[PDB]
Amino acid sequence: ATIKDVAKRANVSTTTVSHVINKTRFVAEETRNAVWAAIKELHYSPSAVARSLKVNHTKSIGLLATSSEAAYFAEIIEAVEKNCFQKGYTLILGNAWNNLEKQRAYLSMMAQKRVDGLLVMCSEYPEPLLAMLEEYRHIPMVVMDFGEAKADFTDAVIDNAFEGGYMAGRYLIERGHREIGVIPGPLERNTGAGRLAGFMKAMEEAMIKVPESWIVQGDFEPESGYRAMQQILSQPHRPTAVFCGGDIMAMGALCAADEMGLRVPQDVSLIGYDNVRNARYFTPALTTIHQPKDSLGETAFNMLLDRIVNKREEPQSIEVHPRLIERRSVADGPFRDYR
Amino acid sequence: ATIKDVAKRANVSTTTVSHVINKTRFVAEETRNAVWAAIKELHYSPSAVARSLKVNHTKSIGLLATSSEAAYFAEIIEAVEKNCFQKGYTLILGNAWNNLEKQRAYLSMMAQKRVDGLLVMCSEYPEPLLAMLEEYRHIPMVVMDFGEAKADFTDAVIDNAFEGGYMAGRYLIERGHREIGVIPGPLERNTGAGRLAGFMKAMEEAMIKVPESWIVQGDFEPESGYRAMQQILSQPHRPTAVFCGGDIMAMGALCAADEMGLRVPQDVSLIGYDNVRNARYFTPALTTIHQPKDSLGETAFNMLLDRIVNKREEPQSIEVHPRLIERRSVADGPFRDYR
DNA sequence: TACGCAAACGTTTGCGT
DNA sequence: TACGCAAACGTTTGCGT
Ligand code: HPA
Ligand code: HPA
Description:
Two copies of one chain form a homodimer.
Chain A: H1 3-10, H2 14-22, H3 29-41, H4 48-55, E1 60-65, H5 71-86, E2 90-95, H6 100-112, E3 117-120, H7 127-134, E4 141-143, E5 156-158, H8 161-173, E6 180-183, H9 190-206, H10 222-233, E7 241-244, H11 247-259, E8 269-274, E9 288-290, H12 293-309, E10 317-319, E11 323-325
Parallel strand pairs in A: 1-2, 1-3, 3-4, 5-10, 6-7, 7-8, 8-9
Antiparallel strand pairs in A: 9-11
Helix pairs in contact in A: 1-2, 1-3, 5-12, 6-7, 8-9, 10-11
The structure holds hypoxanthine (HPA) (2 copies).
The structure holds a DNA duplex.
């Protein structure tokens, strides 16, 4: 169970055992064999803890997420894991739930577990967080959900959420719409505010005013979707189309209309944002802006690995791009032909 | 950065530094202080690798899942993580994708990373797997998705899937139905076969024959849901109700009916199985058998921790129970009153 | 040419006194 | 009464010869 024990059966030095276990130097066949034999009977499993102590790296990665259930989230993480595996890494998944303490806790356990690098996905970034995060500038780390490039000590990957909001708005416009509504994700977030402003910009350009009774805040959870949509058509004058800050919340919105007996999109058009795996199977097939979730994983990993192996020190940042998916939840507005 | 470096600033022994860092023995205030001061400036972070080497435990847990995206799955895992965190543990998430090699790979990396215990969720359990899994009887481990209690070296937690299938079938019956259909998950699985037989039993009791054209296999993915439902009503004689082996696939089924212009449930009743967080927001609100996902996590953790701390050796097994949730996707059948 | 010896990486802990 | 010394846990590796 210990290298020595193997070395004994082998009738060889522990150095030899190491060497053949790692092809780190030439070893006589006859020798290599004996070691293996030993390694087999003794049913040895080289301790990575041992190794990690000497070589100075755990070959493990720590992802400090916000939540692992939410479809959006769930998708990215499964990608990141894909990468770790294929590249030799081990993933340590941690969810802070946007809890400062919880954050500082997980952050600390990881430093102690000595992770080669950190993948951050905290959603909101108040200074107090930006602070502890700094405190760990030593661990190589890339944040995947910043709007811009918040800190100067980590890599970023920008989703261009705004350009997505803008994309969503345009469509709606070029479809015949002028009385639109919007349910955005928590403003304390990129995917919240960012997607929204991108949208409010196409609006300004269109010369469209979004009456505030038509703007109800969500939290990326189907219920809020439900409750907001409810609050939008629960009014005397209601929009003809609505842009939903995220698909799960969209799904929330879809329900309420059905329960209010409104037809989507015959009565109301809905445009979501995320394009999660189940979206097409929404009823009706949800039209939405698709965020490259996979490349967001791989691209994050990749930058980290860089800093890791090539011991990079300067902070990078890489952009990705959302692309409009067209489905069946949007219908022509009152102004299509008048364009 | 090393205990010694702290001990120096402190003007004390590394043993003292350890002792105050762990309240493992009394230390003069004045002393305790100095250490902390040092610990602070030096910005020390005790290596858990160091520690793990001496004390013989990593205080980390390894979950060998099948997939982390699928709603069902995603839910359990987020629970398991919840537990690890609150109980001091670190989670290493691994997805084998039902790939033998991939399995044997992750299994091995974990043994090497020396995890205090293993949480298994492989879905299918062919002998070749049951074999390598055995090979690691040394690591304390509990499998969370066995039908019965397959192996004699791990703990089990039984979901009673059958009793769930049976529950699903009964309802449908007691609702007026007699021409029912079924789309079950891959038979190589508990949640597949198990849920199904439980269902086929209420049928036998009801004296109901399920014509095989009305039995189409799914894979727990919305698409199969879609394609099966499609194949069920795409026939001359179609059931009046259908039991869907799992909610995501249900969601698949819901779409197709809509696209085929059939009304759920006015034209067709659907009963799912899983009761995942979004289910209520399905359109219409999906009626289904709910599987206690959380308790499935906590209960798994808990057993493992037992074996862990209380060094248990005998294999346990604990049952959980599915409970019918009633929603809006089921309507009375032709025989309600005739009962 | 093929291998072995000892030091070492960062801790915790047994015995001290 | 409060603390320190050295051994040790499982490896990898520098120099050998
Ligand atoms: O912050 C978020 N949470 C959940 N889903 C999301 N989709 C986009 N942003 C988010
Ligand atoms: O094996 C499964 N996979 C995905 N979802 C599921 N829900 C129940 N069983 C399963």
